[PDB]
Design a protein around this ligand. Structure first.
Ligand SMILES: Nc1ncnc2c1ncn2[C@@H]1O[C@H](COP(=O)(O)OP(=O)(O)OP(=O)(O)O)[C@@H](O)[C@H]1O
Ligand SMILES: Nc1ncnc2c1ncn2[C@@H]1O[C@H](COP(=O)(O)OP(=O)(O)OP(=O)(O)O)[C@@H](O)[C@H]1O
Ligand SMILES: [Ca+2]
Ligand SMILES: [Ca+2]
Ligand SMILES: [Ca+2]
Ligand SMILES: [Ca+2]
Lengths: 307, 307
């Protein structure tokens, strides 16, 4: 089991990483804080300020600790709630629907998602942090991932790098339709394999067909979305990012999401988040990520959400 | 008159610079925005979108337009209030008490101060902008300058670079004592020349003598100050900045500042701001700006303000 040893190191390291930070007195984030990486060592034998364990010897790299303290706080994630949910209840794997070799876990209480990430991606997240902070403090209705932490586990010379972020679609509300959307069409049909799951993640072409009348929004609700998507896309292309989806969940009826109306007339509440935003191009043209973005919203704000 | 031609170019350029921005639709600030410098040309002859003038031909460089739009807004400075105060009423010079060759002006309504700045200083302000934004959005009771804009006037091959910021001590409240403070002692006595002015800017040694019992603060008011000074100094040393003063004004009685009590017992309202913060050392030791900072607050929060 390569995994049980990964789950272990994670729950171990975060606890030490975040617990040790909670004793140090809180202070503002400085630009200097974003480039910090602190490492702490974990022998199976045990250490002065380190326990021993079933799993093999590893180091636990935690990225930009202070900034994520701030981001967590700013997202209303109480520290020992973070700690309990993540480090004190069995982590749960996930048959990754990602073509990329990245693999996901969730918290037992299903509030957090952990995803693994390319070394390129993690180093880029590290550079996003200023722009992240800036967008977070200007548009608090933003749709981007909510990054709770960035950590690296290194065992036996190999790097596993992770991003703890927010589950957009929790076990809580049952969910009748899901969509991973992009505004592109090629191979945007759920693999017959995916298609037979319980609630399958339908892609674009699936959507234009099964919901051709769309998802309807009140005049007031529609502007808000249209407004902040425009805002996020301007952020995104700024950083020359691509391949990112609008993840969309719909619950039909018979309380914290977006209220909408069906083609037939059903009152339903929608749930959205922008995901897969760490693939930057900082072989693509100068104007290219701009293209991906305009297309992106010109699709969500004309075909996927209507007034 | 080298000056009338400077006052002119300033009032001219800002008007064009800021007026033209007000027609362009508002949007969030991106990291990209901080490094932008837009230039616009002013012939005495006149141009397609440019008038003619008494003064000589110049270009008007305006630094980081979008960010300062944001900073102005965030400081409650309505655009045409900025414009009127600065560009539509005679600018007023000032016998600079600065040993540095920098020279000041104020607005007729005495809400804004313009100061000229070393090319080094302006280029450093340009780099402060991210850290500035970050501190501004975390500590909105911060004592640092309120930067409204950064502009450059270039005439006859020569650079004049300016920083529009906030008058800490306006014509409005009459003011009985002023202090430029640092926590250093050498030559910190008001020059006999300065000392005979109306209300002279007393320096450190002047203070420890004329007000040896200090300035007293309620338990609640004192913590607030002590708290945010600590916060600003941590910002300041972060950027390896030095030579900055706490400017302090006191009004004794017989409504927007800090309430305090005199040695005798007089109820008085204090007015403070941290100034001269663009001299960075990014010949000084690594630990040096840290030293300047600890000394700085350990003086204001023990000798200048007492609980
Ligand atoms: N924040 C999130 N909340 C809920 N589900 C998510 C989240 N992020 C990813 N998922 C699930 O994973 C799917 C896509 O993941 P993502 O695209 O981020 O990973 P990947 O392996 O990089 O995939 P891709 O191959 O498209 O790049 C989504 O359709 C969604 O079902
Ligand atoms: N924001 C402000 N509000 C009010 N007065 C100011 C402000 N900035 C500067 N002054 C006046 O100018 C004096 C010092 O200016 P400052 O130190 O910034 O300029 P300088 O020419 O760089 O001086 P120095 O030689 O000390 O570096 C202050 O004591 C104050 O009287
Ligand atoms: Ca994707
Ligand atoms: Ca990906
Ligand atoms: Ca000074
Ligand atoms: Ca100076």
């Amino acid at each position: 089991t390569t995994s049980s040893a990964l789950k272990g190191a994670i729950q171990l390291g975060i606890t030490h990483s975040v617990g040790s930070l909670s004793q140090k007195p809180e202070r503002d984030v400085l630009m200097q804080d974003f480039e910090v990486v602190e490492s702490i060592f974990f022998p199976s034998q045990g250490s002065s300020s380190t326990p021993g364990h079933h799993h093999g010897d590893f180091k636990f790299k935690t990225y930009a600790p202070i900034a994520f303290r701030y981001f967590r706080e700013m997202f209303g994630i109480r520290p020992d709630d973070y700690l309990y949910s993540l480090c004190n209840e069995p982590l749960i794997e996930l048959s990754n629907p990602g073509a990329s070799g990245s693999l996901f876990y969730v918290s037992s209480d299903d509030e957090f998602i952990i995803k693994t990430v390319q070394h390129k991606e993690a180093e880029f997240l590290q550079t996003l942090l200023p722009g992240y902070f800036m967008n977070l403090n200007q548009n608090m209705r933003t749709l981007l991932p909510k990054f709770y932490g960035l950590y690296c586990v290194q065992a036996d010379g190999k790097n596993i790098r992770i991003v703890v972020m927010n589950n957009l679609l929790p076990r809580a509300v049952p969910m009748h339709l899901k969509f991973d959307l992009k505004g592109s069409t090629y191979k945007r049909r759920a693999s017959p394999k995916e298609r037979s799951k319980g609630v399958p993640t339908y892609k674009d072409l699936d959507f234009m067909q099964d919901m051709p009348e769309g998802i309807l929004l009140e005049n007031d609700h529609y502007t808000a979305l249209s407004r902040t998507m425009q805002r996020d896309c301007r952020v995104l292309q700024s950083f020359k990012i691509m391949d990112y989806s609008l993840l969309v969940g719909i619950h039909i009826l018979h309380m914290g999401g977006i209220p909408a109306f069906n083609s037939k007339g059903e009152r339903l509440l929608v749930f959205i988040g922008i995901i897969d935003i760490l693939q930057s191009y900082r072989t693509v043209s100068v104007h290219r990520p701009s293209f991906y973005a305009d297309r992106f919203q010109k699709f969500m704000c004309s075909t996927v959400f209507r007034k």
